[PDB]
Every structure is written in C-alpha cells, then in structure tokens.
C-alpha cells in the first residue's frame, strides 16, 4: 500500500524563506517560523491564516509547541529563544545565555523544560516557568543542528556538524552515548521515534538512518532524496501507513515505507528546497515549507 497525498492548500505570507513548520499536538494549528523574524499561525485543516507573532530581532531557525498546544518556543540568530503564549501573542520569556545563533529547540513532554542547540556548540536546558538556564552541556565541537527529548523526558538527543549524535541524561548532563556510522558527514537533524525506541538522523550525504540508540545499531537507511547542504527536518508519519517523510534539495517531499525503505510517493509543487515537513497528529496531512525562491507552505492530504 502507498499513500495518495494531494495538494489541498498553499499558504503565502512569510516575506523570506520559511525555516520550520510544526502542527500543534491538539491538531488545530500549524506554526511556521521564517528568516523574516516572524512566527505565523495557520488553521491545520483549511490553511486559513490566523495571526503573526513577532519580537525576534533576527531570523528564526526553529519553533516548537508545548504539549498542551498553549506555548511556542522559537530559536533565533539574535542568540535568544522566546517562549510565546499563542492565544495572547505575548512573549512570556526571552532565554539568554547562548553565545551564538540558536538553531534548534524543543519542550520536554511535561513542557516544564526547553532544550536548545546553538552555533556556540552547546546544548542548553531551560526552566519554562522562570526562563532561566539550568544547565549548559559542552555537547559538540561544531554547531548543534537538532535537539529532542525522548518519550519520558529523561534523555536528550543532539546532532551536530561535528558528525556525531549524542544522548544526554537530562538530570545529570552526562553524555550516555555517541552514535556515528562508517563515514563522518555532518549530522543535520535528529529526533526520537514516537515510541521512544529509535532515533531518526539525517546526514549531509543524502541519507536518513533509523538507529536503535540503546543497541547503538543502524536498523534502516532511507535514500533517494537530495540533502548535501541544508538542515532538513524528517518525520515519522503514524496516522495511516507508517512512513518516513522528508524535504529535499530537488524541491520535492519524499515519503518512504518505514519497514521496507522503498519510496512510496514524491510530492511536487515547491519552487525551491523543501527545508521542513510536519505530519498532523490525527489526520493524514503533511505540511511542507520551502526556501527563499518559494516562501510558501503547502498542505497535502491522503486517504491513507
């Protein structure tokens, strides 16, 4: 079986390249971040523009939802993160401590902590309520491309241009594991699987890999797309068929069968690199976002 993703909506509004798109856990909203220094909120089902959230002084590389869909955290070249109350648009906290661009961010499952990665080669853990930095991990020897908490928040995974994925104990800050395969390309993205058993890692040699991080073993390789330059997000699609989803530098969205690793669909329509994709939590809906020559977000829907 293969999906039948078809283009339903194209979302115009950002004035520069879009950097990240994320569906709210409650399925109601899509959040987008951009090099235009703005966050935009859109209806998840109709793509209807809701509002603009502003305040960063420079471009934004990432945005992430709290698990109750009430807050966003954003990571900016202005070297801050900002915590936003989505309903009011208010900047609750500005998180200051990184010494270079902030590239990536996430809440933990119980949304009392934020994790961030930076061009300063550190991973930082922040208290959501106080907005204060709790820990600085000297994590990598090159910019940190992605950070993610596991299912219970006890672990953080980080990836870096240094070629490593590292697993950190949230409580102690101890490095518990370093993962690398037989070559050492920059690692451009990582996240834990929905069941928390695997990490999905992108490297800038046109490759996605599914790792059992506790065994330290590469279980699956996904290839066929183009990824040698940009930090492109990748997703687990779990609402219908079990897919891997990624953007690509050939301006397509790629969809793989997770088990078989075969390409099952390519989505055409963007006019520039697809930097970010997101999968809706309950409906078979993909959001995709593209770089400076395109500036749009597309919503795609499948029967399976």
């Amino acid at each position: 079986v293969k999906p039948n993703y078809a283009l339903k909506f194209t979302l115009a509004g950002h004035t520069k390249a879009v950097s990240s798109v994320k569906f709210s856990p409650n399925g109601e909203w899509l959040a987008s971040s951009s090099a235009d220094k703005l966050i935009k909120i859109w209806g998840a089902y109709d793509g209807k523009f809701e509002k603009t959230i502003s305040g960063h002084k420079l471009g934004i590389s990432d945005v992430a939802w709290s698990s109750d869909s009430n807050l966003l955290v954003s990571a900016s070249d202005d070297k801050t993160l900002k915590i936003w109350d989505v309903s009011s648009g208010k900047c609750l906290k500005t998180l200051k401590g990184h010494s270079n661009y902030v590239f990536c961010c996430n809440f933990n499952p119980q949304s009392n902590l934020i994790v961030s990665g930076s061009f300063d080669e550190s991973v930082r853990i922040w208290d959501v309520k106080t907005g204060k930095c709790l820990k600085t991990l000297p994590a990598h020897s090159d910019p940190v491309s992605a950070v993610h908490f596991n299912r219970d928040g006890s672990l953080i995974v980080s990836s870096s241009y240094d070629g490593l994925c590292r697993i950190w104990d949230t409580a102690s800050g101890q490095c518990l594991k370093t993962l690398i395969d037989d070559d050492n390309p920059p690692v451009s993205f990582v996240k834990f699987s929905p069941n928390g058993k695997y990490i999905l890692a992108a490297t800038l040699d046109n490759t996605l890999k599914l790792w059992d991080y506790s065994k330290g073993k590469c279980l699956k390789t996904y290839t066929g797309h183009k990824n040698e330059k940009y930090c492109i997000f990748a997703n687990f699609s779990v609402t219908g068929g079990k897919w891997i989803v990624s953007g690509s530098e050939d301006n397509l969205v790629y969809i793989w069968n997770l088990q078989t690793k075969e390409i099952v669909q390519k989505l055409q329509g963007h006019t520039d690199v697809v930097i970010s994709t997101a999968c809706h939590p309950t409906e078979n809906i993909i959001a995709s976002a593209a770089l400076e020559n395109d500036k749009t977000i597309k919503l795609w829907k499948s029967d399976c």
């Binding site: 520069k16 390249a17 879009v18 950097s19 990240s20 951009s34 090099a35 420079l58 471009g59 934004i60 590389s61 990432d62 900016s76 070249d77 661009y101 590239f103 090159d142 910019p143 241009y161 920059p186 800038l204 330059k229 940009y230 930090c231 930097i275 770089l291 400076e292």
Partner: peptide, 7 residues
C-alpha cells in the same frame, strides 16, 4: 538562519 545556513 537555517534557510541559508550551511556547514
């Protein structure tokens, strides 16, 4: 930002 950032 991510939108032009390379290694």
């Amino acid at each position: 930002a991510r939108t032009k950032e390379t290694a």
